[PDB]
Design a protein around this motif. Structure first.
Motif, PDB file in Angstrom:
ATOM      1  N   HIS A  23       0.859  -1.204   0.000  1.00 25.67           N
ATOM      2  CA  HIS A  23       0.000   0.000   0.000  1.00 25.67           C
ATOM      3  C   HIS A  23       0.895   1.256   0.000  1.00 25.67           C
ATOM      4  N   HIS A  58      -9.698  13.583   1.147  1.00 27.04           N
ATOM      5  CA  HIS A  58     -10.663  12.803   0.321  1.00 27.04           C
ATOM      6  C   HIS A  58     -11.842  12.195   1.088  1.00 27.04           C
ATOM      7  N   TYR A  73       4.105   9.926  -1.435  1.00 26.27           N
ATOM      8  CA  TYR A  73       4.350   8.488  -1.542  1.00 26.27           C
ATOM      9  C   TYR A  73       5.800   8.079  -1.824  1.00 26.27           C
TER      10      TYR A  73
HETATM   11  C1  LIG Z   1      -4.348   9.353  -3.249  1.00 22.56           C
HETATM   12  C2  LIG Z   1      -5.397   8.326  -3.440  1.00 22.56           C
HETATM   13  C3  LIG Z   1      -5.206   7.557  -4.711  1.00 22.56           C
HETATM   14  C4  LIG Z   1      -6.333   6.570  -4.919  1.00 22.56           C
HETATM   15  C5  LIG Z   1      -6.222   5.773  -6.223  1.00 22.56           C
HETATM   16  N1  LIG Z   1      -7.364   4.885  -6.354  1.00 22.56           N
HETATM   17  C6  LIG Z   1      -8.038   4.711  -7.497  1.00 22.56           C
HETATM   18  O1  LIG Z   1      -7.712   5.233  -8.562  1.00 22.56           O
HETATM   19  C7  LIG Z   1      -9.242   3.779  -7.373  1.00 22.56           C
HETATM   20  C8  LIG Z   1      -9.994   3.501  -8.697  1.00 22.56           C
HETATM   21  N2  LIG Z   1     -11.261   4.203  -8.113  1.00 22.56           N
HETATM   22  C9  LIG Z   1     -12.482   3.356  -7.966  1.00 22.56           C
HETATM   23  C10 LIG Z   1     -10.479   4.518  -6.809  1.00 22.56           C
HETATM   24  C11 LIG Z   1      -5.001   4.908  -6.208  1.00 22.56           C
HETATM   25  N3  LIG Z   1      -3.898   5.174  -6.879  1.00 22.56           N
HETATM   26  C12 LIG Z   1      -3.036   4.161  -6.565  1.00 22.56           C
HETATM   27  C13 LIG Z   1      -3.601   3.261  -5.686  1.00 22.56           C
HETATM   28  C14 LIG Z   1      -3.024   2.051  -5.069  1.00 22.56           C
HETATM   29  C15 LIG Z   1      -3.777   1.377  -4.137  1.00 22.56           C
HETATM   30  C16 LIG Z   1      -3.270   0.206  -3.524  1.00 22.56           C
HETATM   31  C17 LIG Z   1      -3.974  -0.516  -2.526  1.00 22.56           C
HETATM   32  C18 LIG Z   1      -3.426  -1.634  -1.957  1.00 22.56           C
HETATM   33  C19 LIG Z   1      -2.167  -2.082  -2.349  1.00 22.56           C
HETATM   34  C20 LIG Z   1      -1.454  -1.415  -3.312  1.00 22.56           C
HETATM   35  C21 LIG Z   1      -1.989  -0.251  -3.921  1.00 22.56           C
HETATM   36  N4  LIG Z   1      -1.239   0.413  -4.861  1.00 22.56           N
HETATM   37  C22 LIG Z   1      -1.766   1.488  -5.364  1.00 22.56           C
HETATM   38  O2  LIG Z   1      -1.082   2.205  -6.284  1.00 22.56           O
HETATM   39  C23 LIG Z   1       0.227   1.752  -6.640  1.00 22.56           C
HETATM   40  N5  LIG Z   1      -4.860   3.766  -5.473  1.00 22.56           N
END
Ligand SMILES: CCCC[C@H](NC(=O)C1CN(C)C1)c1ncc(-c2cc3ccccc3nc2OC)[nH]1
Ligand SMILES: [Ca+2]
Ligand SMILES: [Ca+2]
Ligand SMILES: [Zn+2]
Length: 367
Positions: free
Chosen positions: A22, A135, A297
């Motif tokens: 995450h 958010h 991040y």
């Molecule tokens: C600042 C908030 C950013 C939120 C964004 N989320 C989204 O774009 C989701 C698609 N929509 C329904 C919401 C998002 N960008 C990247 C992630 C992300 C979530 C993870 C959750 C568990 C584990 C790894 C994750 N890696 C991520 O990006 C590399 N999530």
């Protein structure tokens, strides 16, 4: 002149863990703290440990049902809350983790306690790097945020301030804050953010507020690669105009560090000096100021950013050579405070920047 700064930090914050892979890492708050302690910035400011905000303080904005769910949900009882998790958007982006509610209470406690200190005229600036979770919605978690500490802190400021100005330099649109105050003129929200095929999908410059709040929401949509020069030439003129027209008596500045060059999730190209120029600009207005964290991040850059922004709040010049600290190896290979921008193309042409600024000035004439 120089201002009194009160800073909030709980030594337990760095232990909250969103889960393997995450991007949200509360450990970045502890790195920030450790770095500014090692620069000796504790000598110039009052350091406070926030209280754990109660479910009651949180329901000044959030619904009773959502707060009851946050207080109850745990990794061991998740299987029993399948329907509630969907309803409140708790899942992949906003996972259930050990101590989730306590993390929300500490993040919120710092922001609300900072607002109380400003209302009491006991400080000029209050800093809560664990806050700024812009958010979160009334009955829903979103984009790694569960409780909207900003909305709660603003509601506290509104007890003593007729008009409060909210400024958001996080790369993401400050949607939860704008939504809470969309129909009121008592809070003007100003968000600068990447817009187009990007989370959360809101923040078009045509979103200006509704009803009594019409012209009290300001959105500056940007493309990939914005640099210090481009950002600086638009931020001071917009904020100066907003200060002139709106005349707020208090300000909340969300300093999300995901707008920095090299961010894991961000596509901007600001340096720490370019990001901190925003704090310097807001400081010149000499109004009670609550400075909050937010996204970020690439954790070594978040720690550098918020350490430098605390130094800016204190009008304290700090050396570029990083002092030794508990996380010294994270700052390699250079071990410097300041960062260099990348060679990425800035898609925000100077004409685009001037055009959007001109369109926003037209809306500000309507105040
Ligand atoms: C600042 C908030 C950013 C939120 C964004 N989320 C989204 O774009 C989701 C698609 N929509 C329904 C919401 C998002 N960008 C990247 C992630 C992300 C979530 C993870 C959750 C568990 C584990 C790894 C994750 N890696 C991520 O990006 C590399 N999530
Ligand atoms: Ca923003
Ligand atoms: Ca508003
Ligand atoms: Zn962000």
């Amino acid at each position: 002149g120089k201002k009194k700064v009160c800073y909030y930090y709980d030594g337990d914050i760095g232990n909250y863990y969103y889960g393997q892979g995450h991007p949200m890492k509360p450990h970045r708050i502890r790195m920030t703290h450790n770095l500014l302690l090692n620069y000796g910035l504790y000598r110039k400011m009052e350091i406070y440990r926030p209280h754990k905000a109660t479910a009651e303080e949180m329901t000044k904005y959030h619904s009773d049902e959502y707060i009851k769910f946050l207080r109850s949900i745990r990794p061991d009882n998740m299987s029993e809350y399948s329907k509630q998790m969907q309803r409140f958007n708790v899942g992949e982006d906003c996972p259930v983790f050990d101590g989730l509610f306590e993390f929300c209470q500490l993040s919120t406690g710092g922001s609300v306690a900072g607002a109380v200190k400003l209302n009491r005229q006991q400080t000029d600036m209050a800093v809560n790097w664990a806050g700024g979770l812009h958010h979160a919605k009334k009955s829903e978690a979103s984009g790694f945020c569960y409780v909207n500490d900003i909305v709660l802190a603003i509601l506290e400021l509104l007890k003593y301030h007729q008009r409060v100005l909210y400024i958001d330099i996080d790369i993401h649109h400050g949607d939860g804050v704008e939504e809470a105050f969309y129909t009121t003129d008592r809070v003007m929200t100003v968000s600068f953010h990447k817009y187009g095929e990007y989370f959360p999908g809101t923040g078009d410059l045509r979103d200006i507020g509704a009803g009594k709040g019409k012209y009290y929401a300001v959105n500056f949509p940007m493309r990939d690669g914005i640099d210090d020069e481009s950002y600086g030439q638009i931020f001071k003129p917009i904020i100066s105009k907003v200060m002139e027209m709106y005349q707020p008596s208090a300000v909340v500045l969300q300093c999300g560090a995901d707008s920095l060059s090299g961010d894991r999730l961000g596509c901007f190209n600001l340096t720490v000096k370019g990001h901190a120029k925003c704090v310097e600009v807001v400081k010149t207005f000499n109004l009670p100021l609550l400075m909050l964290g937010g996204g970020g991040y690439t954790i070594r850059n978040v720690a550098r950013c918020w350490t430098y922004e605390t130094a800016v709040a204190l009008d304290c010049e700090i050396p570029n050579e990083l002092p030794y600290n508990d996380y010294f190896e994270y700052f390699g290979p250079d071990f410097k405070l300041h960062i260099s921008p990348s060679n990425m193309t800035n898609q925000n042409t100077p004409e685009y920047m001037e055009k959007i600024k001109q369109r926003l000035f037209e809306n500000l004439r309507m105040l």
